[PDB]
Amino acid sequence: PVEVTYKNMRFLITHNPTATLNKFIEELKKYGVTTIVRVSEATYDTTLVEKEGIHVLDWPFDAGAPPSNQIVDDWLSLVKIKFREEPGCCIAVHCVAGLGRAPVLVALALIEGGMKYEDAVQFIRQKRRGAFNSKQLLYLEKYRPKMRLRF
């Protein structure tokens, strides 16, 4: 469980539980996460998660493949609204391995928050070493930001 914080944003990058749901739920609730963004095939049932009060959003894309335009647009709007309506909260992004798709979204949040892509890569790699493969680093390098988040 690795946590990334920048300005008004706080993220928890997680993976499929190593160990079962109860420990997982308790940990998320303790971190203040109000939303889980699952971008891959997930190994747990949402029904218990939602009963605990954490909405799950399922925006999957292929491992190593870049997220669709819609996914990026939807993610950036969620980041824009959620942290303002619930200041101090945490957003969880979940990946199969917690090394590619989930850090990629967090990198996009950091870039749209003012970081250049190399700053964001290092910012996440400081918390989760070995994140991002070559295909994914190139995507972050080529990404051209909308630059519409306000702080």
Author numbering: 9 to 26, 28 to 160
Q: Can you provide the manuscript's text about this entry?
A:
pmcPhosphatases of regenerating liver (PRL or PTP4A) are a small family of three cysteine-based phosphatases (also known as PTPs). PRLs employ a two-step catalytic mechanism: (i) formation of a phosphoenzyme intermediate by dephosphorylating substrate and (ii) hydrolysis of the phosphocysteine intermediate and release of free phosphate. The catalytic site is highly conserved and formed by a phosphate-binding loop (P-loop) and a WPD acidic loop. In addition to dephosphorylating substrates, PRLs act as pseudo-phosphatases and bind CBS-pair domain divalent metal cation transport mediators (CNNMs) to regulate magnesium transport.
We use this C49S/D72A double mutant to determine the crystal structure of the cysteine-phosphorylated form of PRL1 (PTP4A1). Small crystals of PRL1 C49S/D72A were obtained with 4′-MUP in the crystallization solution to maintain cysteine phosphorylation. The asymmetric unit contains two PRL1 molecules. PRL1 displays the characteristic cysteine-based phosphatase fold, composed of a five-stranded central β-sheet surrounded by two α-helices on one side and a four-helical bundle on the other side. The omit map clearly shows the density corresponding to the phosphate attached to the catalytic cysteine 104. The positively charged side chain of the catalytic Arg110 interacts electrostatically forming a salt bridge with the negatively charged phosphate group. Hydrogen bonds from backbone amides in the P-loop and an alpha-helix dipole stabilize the position of the phosphate. All three structures show the loop closed with the aspartic acid positioned above the phosphocysteine, ready to initiate hydrolysis. The structure of PRL2 bound to CNNM3 shows an aspartate sidechain inserts into the PRL active site interacting with the arginine in the PRL P-loop. A side-by-side comparison of the structures of the PRL–CNNM complex and the phosphocysteine intermediate shows the phosphate group precludes the CNNM aspartate entering the PRL active site. Mutating the alanine to serine increases phosphocysteine hydrolysis more than 15-fold. In the absence of both aspartic acid and serine/threonine, the phosphocysteine intermediate of PRL1 is stable for weeks.
